Structure 1
Amino acid sequence: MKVRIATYASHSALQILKGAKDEGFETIAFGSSKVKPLYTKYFPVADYFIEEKYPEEELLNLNAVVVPTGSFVAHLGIELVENMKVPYFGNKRVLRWESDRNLERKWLKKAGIRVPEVYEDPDDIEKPVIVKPHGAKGGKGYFLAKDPEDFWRKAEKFLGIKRKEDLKNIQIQEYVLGVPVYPHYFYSKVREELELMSIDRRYESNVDAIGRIPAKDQLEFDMDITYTVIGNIPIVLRESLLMDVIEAGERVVKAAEELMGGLWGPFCLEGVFTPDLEFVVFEISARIVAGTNIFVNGSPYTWLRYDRPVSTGRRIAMEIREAIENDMLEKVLT
């Protein structure tokens, strides 16, 4: 193959590079020197390991295309990624649209995706709400309120607000109760086709541990709820829910075509399913997500339509190969 497939050594690089190997590509992992054994010894999936954060020159010399790891932006920064000379699989423009609260909200609104209602004024609260003090640090100080009077009492106790003037830039959001559900999609630019690749339930600490603690013992302590990502658990959905989940993906993709020059490759809608069978989305991740790591040997969904194991990583590699084969590599790269 002409191009080599390269990725940052974290998040889902094992899955991506394995998928790349399975499709006949030579592979490059780049990142921290202490995780080199992971990709070259314990799981030999990288033909080359470069011990640098972003070795632009070596990658250009190796004819690499970079497959954006889920934490690629977080380790390198949005500005550095946007100015990459090394070709990037997917649309670099989506990065600002998925990480900026307001752009993201507009994307989802245009895609007709059910999201939590935002309250600008505390006196407008008619249903239970979650309030998030700025600057939000992974659920730090988050509390619930049921009505305006309840809000102001808690604003006094937890924030020291005694006059309404003094309420300083916060977030008030409809509290949506449901089970976490993370659908994994892939949009093929080559085939102009959306797929559902897999679904997972993200596994988080300490939030998924507290359910093991008796109510009595929880109440004796002032506990700090946290949402650190630890791992991923495979799930399937109830079958009659798939169509709206897939249509949600179509609309997200369609809206991106009009807003940002398009969306292709892997993405995920992160939300909850309510008791009324509503899919409410908290975030879009316009990138591969760690939940896809379960499905190195395919998913209950890919085995519905392929005769072989297809991970999201392999699907990316298939897309790149197919683009080369049809002389349209440049169309899937930015």
Structure 2
Amino acid sequence: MISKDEILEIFDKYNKDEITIATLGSHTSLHILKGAKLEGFSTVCITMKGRDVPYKRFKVADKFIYVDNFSDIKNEEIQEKLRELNSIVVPHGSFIAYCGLDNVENSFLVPMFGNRRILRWESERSLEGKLLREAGLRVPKKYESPEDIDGTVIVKFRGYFIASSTEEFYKKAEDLKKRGILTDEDIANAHIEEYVVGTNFCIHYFYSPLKDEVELLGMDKRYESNIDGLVRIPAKDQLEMNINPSYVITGNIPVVIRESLLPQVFEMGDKLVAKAKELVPPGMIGPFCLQSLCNENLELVVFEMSARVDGGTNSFMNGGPYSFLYNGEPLSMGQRIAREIKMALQLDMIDKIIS
């Protein structure tokens, strides 16, 4: 529901000489806040007892707004403090989750960096696939039912598993059922797709509405448990174990891509952006990520995406190989966001970046 006018008229009552940058203390906040400080902003960090130490010891937040539980950040009391501090909120994974995507779309009355409407297209598998398909991006083949399996597939609902036949699908579904890991409701709505065999590149882009340009900021590969621990056990020992893979994100490793593939990398970003303009105006604003796998034919297949900042940007908080190229600076995604905010304020174009 929340209008752009409701937001612009909230920001119009802001002290334009004291604009701060706020975010919830988690996910990617460390470089969101650091980047803001480095661009000259004073920063606000929503935190809580037990989870504030990293933000205190890294000295990255000027003002703390403590909540009883991160769920409270939707409360009207918290929205007010943020408005009185002249904060533009930078949204991220943990924030959307703890606040509630519905509360974010029509209950959170605080200016927010990015395209508020498009956060819904990252939450729903159908919208995401619609976007990527319509943008013209390679994705994994989808399988309507366990009976359609004709190759290796991954099945999504942590509770993940791999299958190479219909028979195997049920053997594993059942296994996870009796072990209490999975329930009938989950396996009823199982999502089955082609297992893509390749190298992981989570590609972090930035669309600048001020420059009308898609920029490449960096890349990481996921570090997931238990899978990355499992496959580090020799085959002979794996066969002697009764262990199922899980794919819980635990961290990130820096990576760069083969340079001849950057035209493809950029084209993918350009296409996603051009289509999202049509489907969800004004489209992508700021940080977005394509989570892909590079197959042996040097084709990037995207199995996921984000419409705001992805957690993997943490791998280059001190800048990376790509982010260096622009100005030879240790540029993080967090600082790139802050800069767009800085420039927008200076050019009187806050309306191109907030909603």
TM-score scaled to structure 2, two decimals?
0.85
| Deviation string, structure 1 residues 251-271 (Cα, Å, up to 9, x no partner) | 111111111111111011112
Contact 1:253 1:264 in 2 (8 A): no
Q: Give the aligned residue type for 2:54.
A: L
Report whether the alignment pairs 1:77 with 2:97. no
Letter in 2 for 1:107: L
SS at match of 2:337: helix
Aligned positions of 1:80-99 closer than 5 A: 80-82=103-105, 83-99=107-123
Hey, what does 1:224 align to over in structure 2?
A: 244
Q: In structure 2, the residue corresponding to 1:71 is in which secondary structure?
A: helix
**1:275 alignment partner in structure 2:** 296
Tell me the SS of whatever aligns to 1:34: coil
Flag the 1:266–1:6 CA change in 2: closer, same or farther, 3 A.
same
Partners of 1:247 and 1:155 lie apart in 2 by 36
Q: Structure 1 residue 128: deviation in Å?
A: 3.3
* Deviation readout 1:133-180 (Å, 9 max, x if unpaired): xxx1x344x2312xxxx41x33554457xxxxxx95433322211111
Q: Which residue of 2 aligns with 1:2?
A: 18
Selected match of 2:163 from 141, 144, 165 = 144
Q: What is the root-mean-square deviation in Å for CA atoms of aligned residues?
A: 1.7
Identity of aligned residues (%): 48
Deviating more after overlay: 291-300 vs 259-268: 291-300
Partner of 2:307: 286
Are 1:154 and 2:168 counterparts?
yes
For the residue of structure 1 that corresponds to 2:289, the secondary structure is strand
Match of 2:55, as an amino acid?
Y
1:93-242 superposed matches below 5 A = 93-132=117-156, 136=157, 138-140=158-160, 142-145=161-164, 150-151=165-166, 153-155=167-169, 157-159=171-173, 168-242=188-262
- Given that 1:204 and 1:229 are in contact with CA atoms closer than 8 Å, whether structure 2 keeps it comes out as yes
Query: 1:129, 1:175 within 8 Å by CA — same for their partners in 2?
Result: yes
Residues 94-123 of structure 1: CA distance to partner in whole angstroms, max 9, x if unpaired? Answer: 111011011111010011110011122555
Decide which of 55, 62, 68 is 1:47's aligned counterpart. 62
Q: Amino acid of the residue matched to residue 210 of structure 1?
A: L
Q: Secondary structure at the match of 1:212?
A: coil
8 Å Cα contact 1:297/1:310 also seen in 2? yes
CA distance in structure 2 between the partners assigned to 1:70 and 1:159 by the alignment: 29
Tell me whether 1:23 sits opposite 2:39 in the alignment.
yes
Cα deviation for residue 131 of structure 1 reads: 4.0
Given the alignment, which residue of 89, 97, 122 partners 1:66?
89
Q: Distance in 1 between matches of 2:241 and 2:220?
A: 32
Which of 26, 34, 37 pairs up with 2:50? 34
Unaligned runs of 5+ in 2: 1-16, 175-186
Structure 1 equivalent of residue 29 of structure 2: 13
SS of 1:86 mapped into structure 2: coil
Deviation at 1:125, TM superposition (A): 4.1
Q: Give the alignment of 1:292-311 within 5 angstroms.
A: 292-311=313-332
* SS of residue matched to 1:97: coil
Gaps of 5+ in 1: 161-166
Give the partner amino acid of 1:87.
Answer: P
Structure 2 CA distance, aligned partners of 1:143 and 1:309? Answer: 40
Distance 1:157 1:231, change over 3 A: closer
Mean Cα deviation higher: 108-117 or 302-311? 302-311
* CA distance in structure 2 between the partners assigned to 1:239 and 1:61 by the alignment: 47
In 2, the alpha carbon distance for the partners of 1:115 and 1:5 equals 35
1:304-332 deviation line (CA, Å, top 9, x unaligned): 12132211100000000100111011221
- 8 Å CA contact 2:163–2:169 kept in 1: the answer is no
Which residue pairs with 1:163 in the alignment? none
Deviation for aligned residue 1:38: 1.7
Mapped partners of 2:295, 2:44: distance in 1: 42
Query: Residues 144 and 18 (structure 1 numbering): CA distance in 2 closer, same or farther, change over 3 Å?
Result: same
